[PDB]
Design a protein around this ligand. Structure first.
Ligand SMILES: Cc1cc2nc3c(=O)[nH]c(=O)nc-3n(C[C@H](O)[C@H](O)[C@H](O)COP(=O)(O)O)c2cc1C
Ligand SMILES: O=C(O)c1[nH]c(=O)[nH]c(=O)c1CCc1ccc(-c2ccccc2)cc1
Ligand SMILES: CCCCCCCCCC[N+](C)(C)[O-]
Ligand SMILES: CCCCCCCCCC[N+](C)(C)[O-]
Ligand SMILES: CCCCCCCCCC[N+](C)(C)[O-]
Ligand SMILES: CCCCCCCCCC[N+](C)(C)[O-]
Ligand SMILES: CCCCCCCCCC[N+](C)(C)[O-]
Ligand SMILES: CCCCCCCCCC[N+](C)(C)[O-]
Ligand SMILES: O=C(O)c1cc(=O)[nH]c(=O)[nH]1
Ligand SMILES: [Cl-]
Length: 367
């Protein structure tokens, strides 16, 4: 196949919207529309070849919405409707906070990229908890039906105890989540990425895991750590070592990059913030590949960064990802991108002689 809506969105609707509205306004409107289920028809029907079992769950397809689109858990059901196999909300911080001053998001159209410096704009734990609670049973059913929910946790700008911020998040939202993410890789909170270093991480993660283990069984989420694409080889080794020592459930690979790859064309390339989309794609993929190897393929990875096609998804899966996420591609191609990626991925799995996604995970390593 290959669709009318895909072409219409790509060639007319999205460019027109970007023309009318700055990126943060467009994002806010998109959250609203999605929250109301005002979406183009998602014709694609997930086949069994797309199902994955990981992280204590069944995932009907392996394509999720990355953190940052639904920061505050306002559009979860709309996102499933859009065809994502799983939804991750957040980052959520303990107390509400405004984030950085505007403008703080920038398009690089020539690069199929975005740069953001939101700074964990967040409604806070309390608000989000209540919002999730209002739909908790409906989510339990969705999760049973292979449509899990992740919650990504951040820390407030003025916090004097990062580990406590994460612990508070585990206590408040963990009971509502299939998986939690310790996001220690935003580039837009001072000092945060230092939490990726070995001693800090071990201390923070031990606390987080303790908190988690203290939740009742039916409310006990998987815990993953989301890492930057900008780590040294030493940092990566250290993270793998800690994940193994502590039994962390998985990794999310990667956040945005503070690098500016050679060749960027957008006028806005030198704006401060994290860069996402196509220029991030292979950097991301390579990081997955390295982490999979460092963890002996025993630690589930959710691969993210510059996925806008089936090939992109498959490349990450073959590199070691059990699941993938996308955000920036949505910002270019709109909702039809979801079915596009899934249709393309199913075709390529068939063409490469995989019985389904599961058979492709980590395949490059076994060559
Ligand atoms: C506007 C924007 C906001 C984001 N905010 C968050 C966040 O709150 N937490 C997080 O873990 N990642 C956040 N990210 C990163 C994405 O989850 C993802 O890791 C990254 O953008 C790479 O995927 P992509 O190239 O498909 O966008 C954000 C990304 C963008 C573009
Ligand atoms: O337009 C953007 O630049 C932008 N930037 C971001 O950083 N985040 C965003 O979310 C966006 C907007 C992307 C978007 C997503 C969904 C839609 C949509 C939703 C429902 C129905 C039709 C379109 C439209 C635009
Ligand atoms: C101005 C010359 C015509 C170019 C417009 C592009 C053709 C249609 C694009 C795809 N469609 C919107 C029909 O789905
Ligand atoms: C609310 C819709 C207002 C639309 C006004 C702009 C129409 C320009 C069409 C541009 N394009 C050829 C890319 O579709
Ligand atoms: C109101 C300012 C002009 C924007 C009108 C909306 C259509 C913009 C489409 C731009 N472009 C031709 C590059 O697609
Ligand atoms: C709402 C402020 C700017 C308008 C941008 C585009 C809105 C398009 C509305 C489409 N719809 C068919 C649902 O009415
Ligand atoms: C009814 C047409 C409304 C005029 C819209 C003016 C364009 C807004 C500027 C957005 N921008 C090009 C900076 O993205
Ligand atoms: C955030 C920009 C949204 C603009 C276009 C919305 C199109 C909605 C189509 C709804 N329908 C249910 C009619 O498909
Ligand atoms: O809120 C942000 O600035 C944000 C958080 C995150 O983890 N990644 C990112 O690119 N932006
Ligand atoms: Cl420059």
């Amino acid at each position: 196949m290959a669709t009318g809506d895909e072409r219409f969105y790509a060639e007319h609707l999205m460019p027109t919207l970007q023309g009318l509205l700055d990126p943060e306004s467009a994002h806010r409107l998109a959250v609203r529309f999605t929250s109301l289920g005002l979406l183009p028809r998602a014709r694609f029907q997930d086949s069994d070849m797309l199902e994955v079992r990981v992280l204590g769950h069944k995932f009907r397809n392996p394509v999720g919405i990355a953190a940052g689109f639904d920061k505050h858990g306002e559009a979860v059901d709309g996102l499933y409707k859009m065809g994502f196999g799983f939804v991750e909300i957040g980052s959520v911080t303990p107390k509400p906070q405004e984030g950085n001053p505007r403008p703080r998001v920038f398009r690089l159209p020539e690069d199929q990229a975005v740069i953001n410096r939101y700074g964990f704009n967040s409604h806070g734990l309390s608000v989000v908890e209540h919002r999730l609670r209002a739909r908790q049973q409906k989510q339990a059913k969705l999760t049973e039906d292979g449509l899990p929910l992740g919650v990504n946790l951040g820390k407030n700008k003025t916090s004097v105890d990062a580990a406590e911020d994460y612990a508070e998040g585990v206590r408040v939202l963990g009971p509502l989540a299939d998986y939690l993410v310790v996001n220690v890789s935003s580039p837009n909170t001072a000092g945060l990425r230092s939490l990726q270093g070995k001693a800090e991480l071990r201390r923070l993660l031990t606390k987080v895991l303790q908190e988690r283990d203290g939740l009742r069984r039916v409310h006990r989420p998987a815990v993953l750590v989301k890492i930057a694409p900008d780590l040294t080889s030493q940092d990566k080794e250290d993270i793998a070592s800690v994940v193994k020592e502590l039994g962390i459930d998985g990794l999310i690979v990667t956040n945005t990059t503070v690098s500016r790859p050679a060749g960027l064309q957008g006028a806005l390339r030198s704006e401060t913030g994290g860069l996402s989309g196509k220029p991030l794609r292979d950097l991301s993929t390579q990081t997955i590949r390295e982490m999979y190897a460092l963890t002996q393929g025993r630690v589930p990875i959710i691969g993210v960064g510059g996925v806008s096609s089936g090939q992109d998804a498959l490349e990450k899966i073959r590199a070691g990802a059990s699941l993938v996420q996308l955000y920036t591609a949505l910002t270019f191609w709109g909702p039809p991108v979801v079915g596009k990626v899934k249709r393309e991925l199913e075709a390529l799995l068939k063409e490469q002689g995989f019985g389904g996604v599961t058979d492709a995970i980590g395949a490059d390593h076994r060559r």
